[PDB]
């Protein structure tokens, strides 16, 4: 029982959140957990708000789960999204690089091309691809933003500082950090490629399938494999850049309401999970893609007792992030 203040990032998420609240109100008893919606402009404002007791929960891509864990925020992962299916839940997804058919370049010929990223610091859209190209970048590789801006001939890196690194917002002026920026996120990064602004989009394996319904339209795209070859989009399992951890809901380490967060999400998935309700869907929305939770998620899994971000993420992934911040070739 009682309220969970969910942090919505911008307008579209705020709208889905209010629908969430209302529908949960009609199915959950008076003694059940309720939702309240707190709208912020960016995920970073959501992280600050939770730490300052202005909100209670927000779902974050795993690369951002690390930042949320750092002081003075010290948030912890409490609920994880899972993909694939209820039968065989997967707590990871594949980072891939999508390109247009016959564009004529491999992974080792990315210098000078234009890039579309889901957002600064995110797993598939930034951490994995930039981590793999780190040494191909020109010195000085610090700050990272500068070297990336000089490697590509223009990008859209949402949440980056367009004032200090204008090239990173060339494809999306402002580098807006929310769905108000049409090239934000997985589907936004794909749109950036589809529209012709960029040459490559760093997204997840399911992104193209969530955006292109005809095999004929998808046959116009390919994936860049690490062996400097290209494969069709259905072959991501044999052509991906890395496997990364699921997006996860984070909460305060003190007075965090993790029990209510789990109670709310568990009930929510039972009533409004995949193919559960015709009235409301937790994992899709007429208002946008990946609002509050990823459209590709099938449900939630509780994170084990008192697990910190580092253990949750794993040594390899946390290493990759570290080596990206300081890193020596
Ligand atoms: Fe992600």
DSSP conformation letters of 119-157: -TT-IIIIIHHHHHHTTTSPSP--SHHHHHHHHSS-EE-
Specify whether 240 is located in the same domain as 252. no
Q: Which of these, 19, 8, 53, lies nearest to 272 by C-alpha position?
A: 19
User: 223 and 235 in contact (C-beta within 8 Å)?
Assistant: yes
Look up residue 303 and give its DSSP letter.
Answer: P
Domain-located, residue 317:
no
Task: Quote the ligand 1 centre to 90 CA distance (angstroms).
Answer: 14
Please state the domain count of the chain: 2
Approach to solving: X-ray
Last residue of a domain, one of 247, 272, 287: 247
Specify whether 180 is located in the same domain as 228. yes
The H-or-E segment that residue 59 falls in is strand 58-60
Specify whether 20 is located in the same domain as 58. yes
271: helix, strand or coil: helix
Task: Quote the ligand 1 centre to 35 CA distance (angstroms).
Answer: 24
Specify whether 222 is located in the same domain as 269. no
Specify whether 131 is located in the same domain as 175. yes
Last residue of a domain, one of 214, 229, 247: 247
Specify whether 132 is located in the same domain as 195. yes
CA pair distance 263, 35, nearest whole angstrom: 11
Q: Is the dihedral of CA 75, 119, 129, 234 positive or negative?
A: positive
Task: Quote the ligand 1 centre to 59 CA distance (angstroms).
Answer: 10
Task: Quote the ligand 1 centre to 32 CA distance (angstroms).
Answer: 31
Task: Quote the ligand 1 centre to 122 CA distance (angstroms).
Answer: 6
Specify whether 182 is located in the same domain as 195. yes
Last residue of a domain, one of 247, 271, 300: 247
User: 3 and 264 in contact (C-beta within 8 Å)?
Assistant: no
* Helix residue ranges per DSSP H, the chain: 10-27, 43-51, 62-69, 128-133, 144-151, 185-194, 207-211, 215-218, 258-272, 309-313, 315-325
Resolution at which this structure was determined, Å = 1.8
Look up residue 169 and give its DSSP letter.
Answer: G
Q: What is the maximal distance between C-alpha atoms in the chain? A: 60
CATH number at residue 61: 3.40.190.10
The reply to whether 61 sits in an annotated binding site is yes
- Measured between its terminal Cα atoms, the distance across the chain in Å is 52
CA pair distance 49, 309, nearest whole angstrom: 19
The reply to whether 125 sits in an annotated binding site is yes
The owner of tokens 């981590």 is 131
The owner of tokens 């959950």 is 28
Domain-located, residue 194:
yes
Specify whether 226 is located in the same domain as 189. yes
Q: What does each C-alpha distance from 107 to 202, 240, 292, 327 come to in angstroms?
A: 12, 11, 32, 21
Specify whether 142 is located in the same domain as 232. yes
Domain-located, residue 325:
no
As beta bridge partners, residue 6 has 37, 57
Domain-located, residue 328:
no
227: helix, strand or coil: coil
The reply to whether 236 sits in an annotated binding site is no
CA pair distance 266, 145, nearest whole angstrom: 39
Our CA angle for 89, 92, 94, nearest 5°, is 125
Domain-located, residue 70:
yes
Domain-located, residue 320:
no
The owner of tokens 């084990």 is 304
Q: How many CB atoms lie within 10 A of CB 32?
A: 14
What distance lies between CA 38 and its chain's CA centroid?
20
Specify whether 231 is located in the same domain as 294. no
User: 222 and 233 in contact (C-beta within 8 Å)?
Assistant: yes
The reply to whether 124 sits in an annotated binding site is yes
Domain-located, residue 294:
yes
C-alpha Rg value of the chain to the nearest Å: 19
Domain-located, residue 149:
yes
Specify whether 139 is located in the same domain as 179. yes
User: 289 and 210 in contact (C-beta within 8 Å)?
Assistant: yes
Task: Quote the ligand 1 centre to 130 CA distance (angstroms).
Answer: 14
Specify whether 90 is located in the same domain as 70. no
Q: Which domain holds residue 218?
A: 83-247
As beta bridge partners, residue 100 has 221
The reply to whether 93 sits in an annotated binding site is yes
């Amino acid at each position: 029982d009682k309220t969970v203040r969910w942090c919505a990032v911008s307008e579209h998420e705020a709208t889905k959140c209010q629908s969430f609240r209302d529908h949960m109100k009609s199915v959950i008893p008076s003694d059940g957990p309720s939702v309240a919606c707190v709208k912020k402009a960016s995920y970073l404002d959501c992280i600050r708000a939770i730490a300052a007791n202005e909100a209670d929960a927000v779902t974050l891509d795993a690369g951002l789960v690390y930042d949320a864990y750092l002081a003075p925020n010290n948030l912890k992962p409490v609920v994880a999204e899972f993909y694939g299916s209820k039968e065989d839940p997967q707590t990871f997804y594949y980072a891939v690089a999508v390109v247009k058919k016959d564009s004529g370049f491999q992974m080792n010929q990315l210098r000078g091309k234009k890039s579309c990223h889901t957002g600064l610091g995110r797993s598939a859209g930034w951490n994995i691809p930039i981590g793999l190209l780190y040494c191909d970048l020109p010195e000085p590789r610090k700050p990272l933003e500068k070297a990336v801006a000089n490697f590509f001939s223009g990008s859209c890196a949402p949440c980056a500082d367009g004032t200090d690194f204008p090239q990173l917002c060339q494809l999306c002026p402002g580098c807006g950090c929310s769905t108000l920026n049409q090239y934000f996120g997985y589907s936004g990064a794909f749109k950036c490629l589809k529209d012709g602004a960029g040459d490559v989009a760093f997204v997840q394996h399911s992104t193209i399938f969530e955006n292109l319904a005809n095999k004929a339209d998808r046959d116009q795209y390919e994936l860049l494999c690490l062996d400097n070859t290209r494969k069709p989009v259905d072959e991501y399992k044999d052509c991906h850049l890395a496997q990364v951890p699921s997006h996860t809901v984070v909460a305060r380490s003190m007075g965090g309401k993790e029990d209510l967060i789990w109670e709310l999400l568990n009930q929510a998935q039972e009533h409004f999970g995949k193919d559960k309700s015709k009235e409301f869907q937790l994992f899709s929305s007429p208002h946008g893609k990946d609002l509050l939770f990823k459209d590709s998620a099938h449900g939630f899994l509780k994170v084990p007792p008192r697990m910190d971000a580092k253990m949750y993420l794993g040594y390899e992934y946390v290493t990759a992030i570290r080596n990206l911040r300081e890193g020596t070739c």
